Amino acid sequence: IAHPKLGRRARARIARGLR
Amino acid sequence: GVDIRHNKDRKVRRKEPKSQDIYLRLLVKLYRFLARRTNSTFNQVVLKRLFMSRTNRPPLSL
Amino acid sequence: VLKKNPLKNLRIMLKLNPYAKTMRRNTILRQARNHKLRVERAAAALAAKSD
Amino acid sequence: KGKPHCSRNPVLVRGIGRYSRSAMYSRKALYKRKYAALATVTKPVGGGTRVVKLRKMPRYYPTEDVPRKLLSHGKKPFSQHVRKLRASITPGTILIILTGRHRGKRVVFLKQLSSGLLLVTGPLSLNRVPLRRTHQKFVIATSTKIDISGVKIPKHLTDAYFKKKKKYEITEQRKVDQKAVDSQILPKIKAVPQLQGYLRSVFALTNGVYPHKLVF
Amino acid sequence: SAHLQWMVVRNCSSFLIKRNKQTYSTEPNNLKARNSFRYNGLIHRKTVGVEPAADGKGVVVVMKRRSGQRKPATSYVRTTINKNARATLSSIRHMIRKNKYHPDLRMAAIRRASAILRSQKPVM
Amino acid sequence: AALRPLVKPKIVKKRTKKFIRHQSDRYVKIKRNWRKPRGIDNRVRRRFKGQILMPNIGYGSNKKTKHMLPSGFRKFLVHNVKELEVLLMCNKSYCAEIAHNVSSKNRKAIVERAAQLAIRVTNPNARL
Amino acid sequence: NFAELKIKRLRKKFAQKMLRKARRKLIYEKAKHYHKEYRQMYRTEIRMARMARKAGNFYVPAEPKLAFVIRIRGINGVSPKVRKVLQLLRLRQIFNGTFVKLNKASINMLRIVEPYIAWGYPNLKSVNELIYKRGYGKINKKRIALTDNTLIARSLGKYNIICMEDLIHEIYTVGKHFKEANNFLWPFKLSSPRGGMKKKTTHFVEGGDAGNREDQINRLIRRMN
RNA sequence: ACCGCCCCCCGGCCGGCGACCGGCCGCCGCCGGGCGCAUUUCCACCGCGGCGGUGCGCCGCGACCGGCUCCGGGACGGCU
RNA sequence: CUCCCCCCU
RNA sequence: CACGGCGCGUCGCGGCGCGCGCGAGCGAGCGCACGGGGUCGGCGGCGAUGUCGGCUACCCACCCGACCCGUCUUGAAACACGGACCAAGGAGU
RNA sequence: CCCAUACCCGGCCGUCGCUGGCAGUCGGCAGAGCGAGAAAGAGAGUGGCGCGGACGCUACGCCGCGACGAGUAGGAGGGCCGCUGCGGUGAGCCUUGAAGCCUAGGGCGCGG
Ligand SMILES: [Mg+2]
Ligand SMILES: [Mg+2]
Ligand SMILES: [Mg+2]
Ligand SMILES: [Mg+2]
Ligand SMILES: [Mg+2]
Ligand SMILES: [Mg+2]
Ligand SMILES: [Mg+2]
Ligand SMILES: [Mg+2]
Ligand SMILES: [Mg+2]
Ligand SMILES: [Mg+2]
Ligand SMILES: [Mg+2]
Ligand SMILES: [Mg+2]
Ligand SMILES: [Mg+2]
Ligand SMILES: [Mg+2]
Ligand SMILES: [Mg+2]
Ligand SMILES: [Mg+2]
């Protein structure tokens, strides 16, 4: 997740899930 | 006390043309700006060669 | 930037290493619990000796 | 809207909470608290109406001006500084004033004031000092105490009351407040034998006695 | 051009005075009276000046026009403003800003005008 | 109620005594003006203990408060009225001094003009 | 227009904030894992010694891989060879210190300069305190104090060192890139030893301070920093 | 006679007129005079009035915050 | 920006 | 416990790991602070012919330090040489 | 326990290095960023009221970070240090008092 390139979609996933 | 030598501490390269004419200095201003605000090294080389002396800028023949 | 001592500045230490907070919280709670346990054990031992 | 609840964790140590992030996520019940997405005035004039512009431009700029300052966080005005008090000082304790006009006079202490100064008084009937303020640093707190937990001092007296004005004339309010306080203080100190004379006396240092040796 | 004559005159002007570890410029249309490329009043095509009025009260604002660069006689236009300080400053500010006329001198012109005005007010 | 500068910082000087030339006390022919000794045996040159100090660059005052008068201003010398208007915009930091050659007849005019223009003059009553 | 541009600004802002949050969580979990690993390593030696004693044999612990070296002599009158070795070890000033990984070359190099240095085997607490209090990074040939994790992350990102915890762990365990980490680490400038030294000139074994002291270097560090 | 270059006239393009513009129109700003006539605008004074900036005539004290240090008092734990 | 309960003024 | 949505869930080993959609990577406010170098929205006195300030500079006292310069020289305070004092002139053109 | 001009922390001066940064003062004709671990576009497009906003920039200038600073013989640089005369320039100064000289007066500069 912390990787800027490959973790973009996972970051989007957790961000949307927090909502 | 530090175990160092200060012989070669100061580098000798030119920072600006030794000449006093104004046209070359205007060119130097322009290319200073270009070199420091452009990533291309052609500008850096050109500015460095502008700094140089006459004997270090030999004429180029046709 | 003025360099503050992480070993003495809690939030500077947290900025550099967030897990230090959980470490310090855990050790404070553990020490308090251990001290309470030892105090109560000493009180019980004194009561038994009096008995 | 919503009544402001108190903090869910007691302060374990300054800056560290008792409960961790997950314990807080549980206690706040955030698992069910999810959320998702002037300068002109018109006036009549007797013409027509005029749009007057308040906050008008200045009629003089100075020759030069200083720049702004950088921002800092830990600095607070004296009004909201946290007030500290020595452990040895409790209401009903005898203090020794060290620097005022009342040098070395034994004085009873009543209350810590709002700005940190000590509201102090030894009944001026015997040691001749009124209701007064004194800095906690410039007094020696001896280990002799009386019980004044059952006395009432007026709430109207405060730092605004004791603030200097502007010849100084004592006011009838000052007199009546001093009488009200001393009428309760005096019987308490008269119960303890040889205490009124002790308060009347004045502390001093003679040869052969040293503060670091003597205890008080 | 402009930078060329600036390089010519940066150190060899009759308006230059240098003493006490200082340096000052003297030519008329020079706000802040200091030797600099921005504020030199003879180099640039667009120049702003603020002077006290010939009469004991008022402020003269001088603007360099665009056409007659080589014609000194008909190169400056002068307007005299004799009103309250607030409206004088507002007029100068509008002239500098809404004309897009050398905007970097707006605050300098306002400061200089304010000063001239105070000077004009009787002393205590 | 003289005019005050824009800012009055705390001027700090690393040294206040003058730098006295070595052996200038023994002789009158030796002026007080500093000269670096260059003798092969000179104690002052060799920096012996308890001798006359030698000026270094380390004593240099800080740039923020360098050349500041005790009143907080910086000096500027003027010879006539026309040079006074130069200091119109360097008002709150630069004070004016009348040159000693100026006659009193012009001195009164210069001081009165400076009074109008709110420029401080350090010697306003120099001829009375 | 820019009805989309304005929202794109804050979209980028939110993306960057989420990335920063993820990085913080990563370094927090890595610190927790490092703490677990340290506890495991500490208990393992105790366990092995106990089992060896129970069996009646002996358990010789592994030779230490990391040492701390402090220069304890001045600049005046140094043999050229000793001067060269001190330059290589980066001790150009009295009461300078540095970490050295151990092998045959390091042993012989330190033996050459025994009279000029006091060196030992640093403790985990000593490493922690030295990194946090005196630790400066050598960024762009400039001595920069390490006040933020990004300074470490740029200079050692390619080696997967991204914060103080990575730097300390890598130094203490002598990782694969210990050379890069130590070289990025500027030599430590330690204060004079509070309480004084025993005798600077002679060896530690004969009551002095020079030479190798196995674990007393921690006692020395406690007062020199 | 031919070729090269340059000056001038005419015709056609390209570019500039910011080291070098005139007229017309539009927009804006400024100034002078009337219109405006006082809940607008301006000038001067008072309050120990407030906010912001800079400072105090001299001599002093206190408070909290941060950096660096020296020291003291507690309590907890590991190999032992 | 959910809802309850307890205590002191 | 730096755990927290629903799903399609093999993106899967047997669920956990771990992928694809969910107007599609936008929730907002207030508040406290061990948080990119000090502020007080805190105070107290003394001021007209005897008092306030004046680093340095004038004189004096005290404590510590302190041998006379220039020069040749391995080595100068030297029982090595030049020098009573002052003014002007005086030597890489 | 005592203290060196040594070491650690802080302030200030200067030197050296980064051959560092700034022409972006891009304003009702505008939209105020390029400090942020990851070589590169706040990319352009086509289909399913109140008129308002400090300083700057002698670019031979201004600003920011680090490190360092002994010195004879000797070498180099900068002197808004000094003396005399010449070409320019200061609508400079001056019998309402120039030069020079004296001073327990007020100051500036590390120093000349
Ligand atoms: Mg040094
Ligand atoms: Mg060299
Ligand atoms: Mg010698
Ligand atoms: Mg030795
Ligand atoms: Mg000690
Ligand atoms: Mg020896
Ligand atoms: Mg002596
Ligand atoms: Mg000789
Ligand atoms: Mg010799
Ligand atoms: Mg002889
Ligand atoms: Mg001889
Ligand atoms: Mg003789
Ligand atoms: Mg002579
Ligand atoms: Mg330092
Ligand atoms: Mg040197
Ligand atoms: Mg004399």
Residue E92 contacts D where some CB pair is shorter than 8 Å: no
E60 phi and psi, to 5 degrees?
A: -100, 125
Kindly determine whether the C-beta of residue F45 is less than 7 Å away from any atom of nucleic acid strand J: yes
Q: Which residues contact C37 (CB under 8 A, 6 or more apart)?
A: none
C15 phi and psi, to 5 degrees?
A: -60, -45
Q: In Å, how far from its chain's centre is CA G1?
A: 56
The SS3 assignment for G5 reads: helix
User: In 3D, which of F91, F3, F84 has the Cα closest to residue E112?
Assistant: F91
What is the least distance, in Å, from the CA of E57 to any CA of chain F? 13
Tokens standing for E91? 């007029």
Round to whole Å and give the CA distance between F38 and F41: 9
Are the Cβ atoms of F115 and E123 closer than 8 angstroms? yes
Phi and psi based region of residue F26 (left: phi greater than 0; alpha: psi -120 to 50; beta: remaining)? alpha
Phi and psi based region of residue B16 (left: phi greater than 0; alpha: psi -120 to 50; beta: remaining)? beta
Separation between the CA of G153 and the C1’ of K20 (whole angstroms): 22
Round to whole Å and give the CA distance between D106 and G86: 68
Nearest protein residue, CA measured to C1' of K21: B36
Are the Cβ atoms of E21 and F67 closer than 8 angstroms? yes
Looking at the DSSP bridge assignments, the partners of residue D94 are D108
Q: Are E52 and E60 in contact (CB under 8 A)?
A: yes
Q: What ligand is nearest to the CA atom of residue F49?
A: 7
Q: Are F122 and F3 in contact (CB under 8 A)?
A: no
Q: How far is residue G192 from each of residues B15, G67, G132, G188, G196, measured CA to CA in Å?
A: 42, 20, 19, 12, 8
Are the Cβ atoms of D64 and F6 closer than 8 angstroms? yes
Tell me the chain D residues in contact with residue E119 when contact means C-beta distances shorter than 8 Å.
none
Rounded to 5 degrees, what angle do the CA atoms G22, G28, G34 make? 135
Considering only residues 19-58 of protein chain E, which place a Cβ less than 7 A from any atom of strand H?
Answer: 45-46
The SS3 assignment for E82 reads: coil
How many Å lie between the centroid of ligand 3 and the Cα of residue F36? Answer: 17
Q: In Å, how far from its chain's centre is CA G89?
A: 14
Considering only residues 163-182 of protein chain G, which place a Cβ less than 7 A from any atom of strand K?
Answer: none
CA dihedral in degrees (G215, G218, G223, G224; nearest 10)? 100
> Chains G vs D: touching, with 3+ CB pairs under 8 Å?
no
G121 phi and psi, to 5 degrees?
A: -105, 110
Q: Are C6 and G167 in contact (CB under 8 A)?
A: no
Considering only residues 137-166 of protein chain D, which place a Cβ less than 7 A from any atom of strand J?
Answer: 163-164
Exposure of D19 by Cβ count < 10 A (0-12 exposed, 13-18 middle, 19+ buried)? middle
Kindly determine whether the C-beta of residue B10 is less than 7 Å away from any atom of nucleic acid strand K: yes
Tell me the chain A residues in contact with residue D25 when contact means C-beta distances shorter than 8 Å.
none
Kindly determine whether the C-beta of residue F79 is less than 7 Å away from any atom of nucleic acid strand K: yes
- Full DSSP string of B2-60: -----TT-S----SS-S---HHHHHHHHHHHHHHHT---HHHHHHHHHHHS-STTS---
Residue B22 contacts E where some CB pair is shorter than 8 Å: yes
Are the Cβ atoms of E86 and D56 closer than 8 angstroms? yes
Residue C6 contacts G where some CB pair is shorter than 8 Å: yes
Tell me the chain G residues in contact with residue C17 when contact means C-beta distances shorter than 8 Å.
27, 31, 163-165
Considering only residues 60-89 of protein chain F, which place a Cβ less than 7 A from any atom of strand J?
Answer: none
Residue E107 contacts F where some CB pair is shorter than 8 Å: no
Secondary structure element (H or E) that encloses residue E97, with its range: helix E85-97
Q: Are G162 and G90 in contact (CB under 8 A)?
A: no
Q: Are D180 and D156 in contact (CB under 8 A)?
A: no
Separation between the CA of G137 and the C1’ of H24 (whole angstroms): 72
| CA atoms within 13 A of residue D171's CA, in its CB half-sphere | 8
The SS3 assignment for G170 reads: helix
β-pairing verdict for F97-98 and F77-78: parallel
Separation between the CA of E90 and the C1’ of H16 (whole angstroms): 38
- Full DSSP string of G124-161: HHHHHHIIIII-EEEETTEEEE--SHHHHHHHTGGGT-
User: In 3D, which of G174, G222, G163 has the Cα closest to residue G67?
Assistant: G174
What is the least distance, in Å, from the CA of A19 to any CA of chain D? 5
Separation between the CA of D62 and the C1’ of K51 (whole angstroms): 23
Q: Which nucleotides of H are covered by protein (CB under 7 A)?
A: 18-22, 28-32, 36-44, 48, 53-56, 61-71, 75-80
Tell me the chain E residues in contact with residue F67 when contact means C-beta distances shorter than 8 Å.
20-21
Looking at the DSSP bridge assignments, the partners of residue D96 are D106, D140
Helices (H) and strands (E) in chain G, counts: 8, 7
How many Å lie between the centroid of ligand 14 and the Cα of residue F47? Answer: 24
- Full DSSP string of D125-142: TTS---SEEE-GGGEEEE
